[PDB]
Amino acid sequence: GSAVPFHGAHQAGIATPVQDRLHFAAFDVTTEDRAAFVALLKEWTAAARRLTAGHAVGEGAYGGLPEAPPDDTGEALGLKPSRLTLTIGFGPSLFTRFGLADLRPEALADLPKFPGDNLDRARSGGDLCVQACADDPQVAVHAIRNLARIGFGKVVVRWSQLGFGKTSSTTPDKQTPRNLLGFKDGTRNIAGTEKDRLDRFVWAAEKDGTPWMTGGSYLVARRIRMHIETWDRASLQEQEDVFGRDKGEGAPVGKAKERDEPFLKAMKPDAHVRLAHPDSNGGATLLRRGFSYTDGTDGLGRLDAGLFFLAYQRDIRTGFVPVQRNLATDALNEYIQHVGSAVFAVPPGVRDADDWWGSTLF
Amino acid sequence: GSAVPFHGAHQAGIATPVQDRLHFAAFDVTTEDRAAFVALLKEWTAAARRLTAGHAVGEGAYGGLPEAPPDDTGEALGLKPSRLTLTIGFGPSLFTRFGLADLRPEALADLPKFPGDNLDRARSGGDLCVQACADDPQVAVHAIRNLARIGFGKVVVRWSQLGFGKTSSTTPDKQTPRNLLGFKDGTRNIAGTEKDRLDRFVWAAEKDGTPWMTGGSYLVARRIRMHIETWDRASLQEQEDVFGRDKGEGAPVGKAKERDEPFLKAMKPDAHVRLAHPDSNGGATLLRRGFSYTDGTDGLGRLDAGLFFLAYQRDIRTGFVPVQRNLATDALNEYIQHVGSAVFAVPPGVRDADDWWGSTLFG
Ligand code: HEM
Ligand code: HEM
């Protein structure tokens, strides 16, 4: 029920143990006034310091002047911090504002079009994002709702995504969660304790060419629909062949235990794991941090559900992009469709109680 | 606790303690064959027995013949029972099928049109419902997804609602949850411990007119959108005046503690609690069992949120209808809009390991 520290060299919510729930919001900026946006960033940081400690924003949820609206909307009263993290990111489109054009990081690359894409533009992109992760979905929702309210008049919510359960791990010592295809998802990721791998594959360094981003990371979000009806008709062997792992234990093919290292040549040439593995991608490695979603029905008798994929990396160009390109022939493609997309530069951490989101940029 | 028992004189998921999460599905029937539908009810019941004990349906999620689809889709492997309950209901429209027209309960009344309704017909009604409640949302989702899969060919999913947090209580000894307007919601309800109140206000009795429904209940669902942006601009006093209780403690006006009984005359005439209270409605009393939701954004730059309201009663005509009618002048109406609705007859419980959902209706 405990708290994750908000301050650090890095933002929390990346290497941190993956919490059970997600509320992710993409915002568009409506002010053209740089000072006003800086003011918002500071007010949001202050709010985030309270929220992540389980406290109400501002002057609280009640007990203020009767004629004033409460500063905090109140639906988290009585709850716990619940490992809430709030992680901000800046989209490419933000850099067209506030005289920022020349500070857009080269490693914040626009994604190419990928075969199969059916992207909903209204649920793609965004000038900025806030990732709220917590074990209690109401804590996460409360955070986003209050940050949106604070930003009234300066930002709007472009799109938002609830993730009801995690499909990712940065803690290999704990149980790997399952996605809605019924497979464990997160076995071979990056652990929060793997400081060398995080430096190599996740955190931007000053020498990479964008100083303000040192200690930050780059995020790719992909809303991925699952063709549940088609999947659920497939045989056990078909499903296992798609991935290259068995379903129940989640071991690589021919192995008895989940965390045994794969022998890729024993998997089908189009197996997901074989195509996604670093060895198949010139060493490219991701920190995957996604969650499952369900968004009602298709209007035509079927549940709609999928996976809101999130990947952190030191450079989009050496992380997500090469790996996704190598999934052009993936056997998984029969059963999924990417339907939303965004990229964001996630700045370095809030160093202390005087610091503020985006201070290295602004 | 870990698990809630599935069998009983009553279905679980009504008087039982309110779990943290909800997946609610309304289904429409596609088969015209009554035997085929009875076979589904039995297969569903068997599945529900496994799911509510944390076990996979059928022969499991793996380990079967390689060339066969697994019986269970696998996403609950490694999870806990999570207090899962599965509660089935039958909509008015079901009774137009399978020669049933004359067995529709009179207490399963269609709702009147209410002032301010803006019902999306695609997210209203349904021949059947399954309410899945659990502390782990993936346990609930897995159950709905698997029930839908087992049923496919005989039923489809008309509409689906995830409730990410509860806004209701059947356990006064525990903390009352808050809705997305930030108020405690469930203080004056009907508790699971109030066995006589349940008999008076929640369970159908044999002499009420519909023998097969004895030990069942009638459910009203209302999807209620909240105008969060408008509410959040209202003063603390305005918000407290809307309900009749203070926000932080949730006490009635003029009282110090949440559970102090309300003094209705001290509330505004249009206050929600004053209009909803049994004293204002000829004694009518509900078992409210709803949950919060958020489903993306509106057209227009704002989070989309509300309350998926659920009410159980012994008769829709003497429970939800009079109370909701009395809410015509509610101060709350400024900030809410009913956008989906359905009613269901929730049959009696699955008595034992040989019984099946709906056995008293079908024979
Ligand atoms: C709905 C979509 C997806 C599903 C259901 C899925 C499922 C899985 C599963 C079951 C595994 C094996 C266990 C593990 O995490 O080690 C896995 C591995 C992995 N996936 Fe995916 N995945 C999806 C999309 C993607 C995308 C879009 C990418 C990258 C562009 C990706 C990259 C990876 C990588 C890098 C691994 C680890 C390979 C290794 O080093 O062994 N996945 N995925
Ligand atoms: C989004 C919509 C709604 C919200 C936010 C809401 C909120 C509340 C709140 C905060 C309370 C006070 C605490 C409590 O005793 O539970 C309350 C009481 C109550 N509400 Fe609502 N409510 C809503 C809709 C409804 C509807 C649709 C009905 C019935 C048709 C209803 C019936 C009641 C009843 C019976 C009480 C208890 C009154 C008493 O006996 O003291 N509510 N509600």
Numbering used by the authors:
A (entry chain A): 55 to 416
B (entry chain B): 55 to 417
From the primary publication:
Dye-decolourising peroxidases (DyPs) are a distinct structural family of peroxidases possessing an α + β dimeric fold that houses a b-type heme coordinated on its proximal side by a His residue. The soil dwelling bacterium, Streptomyces lividans possesses three DyPs; two belonging to the A-type and a third belonging to the B-type sub-families. The two A-type homologs, named DtpA and DtpAa react in their ferric heme state with H2O2 to form a two-electron oxidised derivative that is an Fe(iv)O heme carrying a porphyrin π-cation radical (Fe(iv)O[Por˙+]) – termed compound I.34–36 In the presence of a substrate, reduction of the porphyrin π-cation radical results in the formation of compound II (Fe(iv)O), with a second substrate molecule reducing compound II to the ferric state. By using an A-type member of the DyP family (DtpAa) as an exemplar, we combine protein engineering, X-ray crystallography, hole-hopping calculations, EPR spectroscopy and kinetic modelling to provide compelling new insights into the control of radical migration pathways following reaction of the heme with hydrogen peroxide.
The Y345F variant, creates a DtpAa protein with no Tyr residues within 15 Å of the heme on the distal side with the double variant, Y345F/F347Y, mimicking the distal heme Tyr arrangement as in DtpA. High-resolution X-ray crystal structures determined to 1.23 Å (Y345F) and 1.27 Å (Y345F/F347) resolutions, corroborated the desired amino acid changes. The X-ray crystal structure of the double variant reveals that the Asp358 side chain undergoes a positional change, relative to that observed in the Y345F variant and WT DtpAa, enabling for a H-bond network to form with a newly appeared H2O molecule and the Tyr347 phenol group. This arrangement mimics the proton acceptor architecture identified in DtpA, considered important for creating a stable YO˙ species. Not surprisingly, the fastest hole hopping pathways (τM 10−3 s) in the Y345F and double variant remain dominated by the proximal Trp/Tyr dyad. However, in the double variant, a hole hopping pathway is calculated (P3), with a τM value on the same order of magnitude to that calculated for the Tyr374 pathway in DtpA. Thus, the introduction in DtpAa of a Tyr at position 347 distal to the heme facilitates a new hole hopping pathway. In the case of the double variant (mimics the Tyr arrangement of the distal heme in DtpA), a lowly populated EPR signal, with a maximal intensity at ∼3 min was detected. The line shape and position, albeit of a low signal-to-noise ratio, are consistent with a possibility of the signal being caused by a YO˙ species. In the double variant, although the engineered distal Tyr347 is present, and indeed identified as the YO˙ species in the triple variant, it is minimally populated.
